Scaffold this active site. Sequence first.
Site, PDB file in Angstrom:
ATOM      1  N   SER A  17      40.832 -27.377   7.074  1.00  8.54           N
ATOM      2  CA  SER A  17      41.409 -27.490   8.329  1.00  8.54           C
ATOM      3  C   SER A  17      42.005 -28.957   8.289  1.00  8.54           C
ATOM      4  O   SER A  17      43.132 -29.225   8.664  1.00  8.54           O
ATOM      5  CB  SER A  17      40.212 -27.703   9.255  1.00  8.54           C
ATOM      6  OG  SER A  17      39.303 -26.581   9.156  1.00  8.54           O
ATOM      7  N   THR A  18      41.203 -29.828   7.306  1.00  7.64           N
ATOM      8  CA  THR A  18      41.842 -31.135   7.126  1.00  7.64           C
ATOM      9  C   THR A  18      43.091 -30.884   6.328  1.00  7.64           C
ATOM     10  O   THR A  18      43.821 -31.887   6.488  1.00  7.64           O
ATOM     11  CB  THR A  18      40.730 -32.111   6.469  1.00  7.64           C
ATOM     12  OG1 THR A  18      40.568 -31.643   5.494  1.00  7.64           O
ATOM     13  CG2 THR A  18      39.407 -32.185   7.512  1.00  7.64           C
ATOM     14  N   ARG A  43      49.236 -12.849  31.033  1.00  8.31           N
ATOM     15  CA  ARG A  43      48.441 -13.641  31.968  1.00  8.31           C
ATOM     16  C   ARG A  43      49.222 -14.500  32.538  1.00  8.31           C
ATOM     17  O   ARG A  43      50.245 -14.802  31.904  1.00  8.31           O
ATOM     18  CB  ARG A  43      47.250 -14.253  31.142  1.00  8.31           C
ATOM     19  CG  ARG A  43      45.983 -13.400  31.233  1.00  8.31           C
ATOM     20  CD  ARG A  43      44.744 -14.704  30.970  1.00  8.31           C
ATOM     21  NE  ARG A  43      43.922 -14.947  32.346  1.00  8.31           N
ATOM     22  CZ  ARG A  43      43.374 -16.009  32.250  1.00  8.31           C
ATOM     23  NH1 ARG A  43      43.500 -17.068  31.591  1.00  8.31           N
ATOM     24  NH2 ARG A  43      42.686 -16.245  33.459  1.00  8.31           N
ATOM     25  N   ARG A 136      27.727 -34.730   9.334  1.00  6.23           N
ATOM     26  CA  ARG A 136      27.720 -34.671  10.724  1.00  6.23           C
ATOM     27  C   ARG A 136      26.689 -33.804  11.334  1.00  6.23           C
ATOM     28  O   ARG A 136      25.735 -33.475  10.479  1.00  6.23           O
ATOM     29  CB  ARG A 136      29.136 -34.196  11.123  1.00  6.23           C
ATOM     30  N   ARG A 147      25.458 -20.884   7.442  1.00  9.36           N
ATOM     31  CA  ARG A 147      26.990 -21.193   6.944  1.00  9.36           C
ATOM     32  C   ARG A 147      26.903 -21.312   5.398  1.00  9.36           C
ATOM     33  O   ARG A 147      27.884 -21.121   4.827  1.00  9.36           O
ATOM     34  CB  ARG A 147      27.202 -22.595   7.765  1.00  9.36           C
ATOM     35  CG  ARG A 147      27.727 -22.288   9.058  1.00  9.36           C
ATOM     36  CD  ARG A 147      28.497 -23.474   9.491  1.00  9.36           C
ATOM     37  NE  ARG A 147      29.755 -23.854   8.741  1.00  9.36           N
ATOM     38  CZ  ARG A 147      30.471 -24.790   9.067  1.00  9.36           C
ATOM     39  NH1 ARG A 147      30.590 -25.585   9.861  1.00  9.36           N
ATOM     40  NH2 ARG A 147      31.628 -25.053   7.872  1.00  9.36           N
TER      41      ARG A 147
END
Lengths: 193, 194
Positions: A17-18, A43, A136, A147
């Site tokens: 993601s980074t 929608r 974190r 995970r």
Amino acid sequence: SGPRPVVLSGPSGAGKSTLLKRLLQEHSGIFGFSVPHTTRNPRPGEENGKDYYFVTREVMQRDIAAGDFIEHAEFSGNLYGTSKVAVQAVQAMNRICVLDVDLQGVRNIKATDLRPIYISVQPPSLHVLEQRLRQRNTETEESLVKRLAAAQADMESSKEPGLFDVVIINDSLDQAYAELKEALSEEIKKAQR
Amino acid sequence: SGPRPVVLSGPSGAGKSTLLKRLLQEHSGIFGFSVPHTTRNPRPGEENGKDYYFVTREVMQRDIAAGDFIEHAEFSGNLYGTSKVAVQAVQAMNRICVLDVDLQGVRNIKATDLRPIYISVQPPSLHVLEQRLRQRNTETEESLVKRLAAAQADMESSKEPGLFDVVIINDSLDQAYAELKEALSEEIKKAQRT
């Protein structure tokens, strides 16, 4: 026809993601994302070609049988998913189509005539993957352990010979981004000309 | 999906374009037009999903074989055409997709599984079409007679059983417009409701 797409896979917090946000920046107008299909009624605010490709169920099942769809799902009687021609529509615009899919999503891309660069980013070890995840606080000591177990499967699965053309060890973000940029070298140069 | 598409055809100069533009002016957000496909590389400024559905030559031939494209052509080694899926993509957006095509274009929509409303705009006669066209003073003689010669083919082609659900004779542009709105009343009222 255009630049080859890119397939990103790996653990959630392993830095993909980074690395992608670091790739979107510093490369303006080079990367794009495919538009999924659906048989659901639009929608309010949605528009065709930007949010969804709105088709009928009969056409989507026909194209599903034709092998045009990588991802596919049915929520409440309507179909959803990403089609291969939607990825090619991005490639036609001289833009690199990003694809972030699980290990199953990597197999479906191999089925279609799409020829992207399969790239798997991985932590150097689960000890530092545990370390960064423990820095974190987003899990509750139970979702975390799942995970690590979920990451362990994708680390061993990324060792499948011939499944990922380039595997990148996230020793450091500078070294990982340099290896990501060199892996997608001719595709940006094709998109930057 | 939603509102039923419409097919507007007929001879040139009989009021098909004037009626269609007036209809679009009165009813905003209710009508729309399909986006065609092509295998040609995009041009600067063009956008996928707005100007063209940019795909490869492999899928266009495959989708054409599946009876998807109403019309299709080829020039400069690339394929171009309009698909039924693009027409259905407009219908999904609660818009009545207008298909301004010729006689052969009308027959090609008859093959697809779309359920449109076939309307033909025709003049009172070929003689009345001549008087209305000769007053425009915008044509040479050779081009004028060619327009009437081609019109007679389409005027007589309008005389087929079941070819058009509704045929409007443009005697007065107001009464012809009221007939067009009446033939599309339920499709317009469906779009306005949704």
